[PDB]
Symmetry: D2
Subunit: 118 residues, 4 copies
């Protein structure tokens, strides 16, 4: 219970956001946030980056057009949304992946600057 399960992710888009449409004209954007744990000593005596988390994201409407206009592969982003499960297909009788249904996203300003325009 307690409504949906929300989540915030920070990471980089593994690719350019795929923008697609509905016969009525509603935009939906799809992309994946690769989240790599930095300074997460895991293997040998030394230290570096840890294994990565890849979450596929969905976003709709105006924001979808903005996501596609504003972001590309490699962009560092801050994302909030809610985790949704989906039963997917072809090679997998009744597949199932988790996905984030985005509420808000933006390019992080840790290593980059940004011009904000409507």
């Amino acid at each position: 219970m307690a409504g949906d399960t929300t989540i915030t992710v920070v990471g980089n888009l593994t690719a350019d956001p795929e923008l697609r449409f509905t016969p009525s004209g509603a935009a939906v954007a799809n992309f994946t946030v690769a989240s790599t744990p930095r300074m997460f000593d895991r293997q040998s005596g030394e230290w570096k980056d840890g294994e990565a988390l890849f979450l596929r994201c969905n976003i709709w409407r105006e924001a979808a057009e903005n996501v596609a206009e504003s972001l590309t592969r490699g962009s560092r982003v801050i994302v909030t949304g809610r985790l949704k499960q989906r039963s997917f297909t072809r090679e997998g009788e009744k597949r199932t992946v988790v996905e984030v249904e985005v509420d808000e996203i933006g390019p992080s300003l840790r290593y980059a600057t940004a011009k904000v325009n409507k």
Copy 2:
């Protein structure tokens, strides 16, 4: 590149916590939290099922305190994992940091 992705989940254990032991003898408890959105409105909207892992002393306490159907509050960090299983799939799991039975519909006698 960015810390550990945290998550809080509230829901019900789909079963009793499976308790096991790692090679060095670390107590590990596994279980799955079924999270159902209460939600013209629907009722039984699409539930979310997350597999959880928890270690050491807490694993023992979870195994001693919780059962199938227990409503729980869980915080931890999402981790992705791959696994062969007869020559390989990839599932997201929660590495639990804290978990407790929820007090919304129940009372609890804590043994500190």
Copy 3:
């Protein structure tokens, strides 16, 4: 402009939960979660103290199940509030959605 700001807090009740009743007779429980960062490293880094509010049946269960020093997992949404108090200050508080005693150092007998 943006939904309700949620928060999860883990820590210890600074005292026993104060139970009270609203004019219509709604059960409301208040208490404060002291959250201490474990942390060349320090030890008793600056603790965070958050006042919590919880309502109805859960308030009763909290008051029946929890005491000063109980370690708890809490989720809710941050709310700001102003108050006269002898002609006015403004404090942030958590409106609890779920709370439970943590199973990290303790076991719990849930009464579903």
Copy 4:
């Protein structure tokens, strides 16, 4: 326990980010996120926006310069960080406010587009 208490906030800066410095040259930016619950029926029979949450934020280093270069009063932002208490002063024997120590922030792309440049 469990390390720090993290938080994600979405909202608008009540003002332009105040940028300041340290004798050594480290940038720190301060600003406040006004978070207004939208579609949160509270008073009369009708519905609209609910009462607002104002959290003062702190951010350091490079990001602080980027925040100050990129954002202004009214900007909608996504913020993640950790809640910190502080004992503040003048008119208040030993004051105390909560504050967010920002880890990442960015302009939300719900109602705006953005050019990302390093």
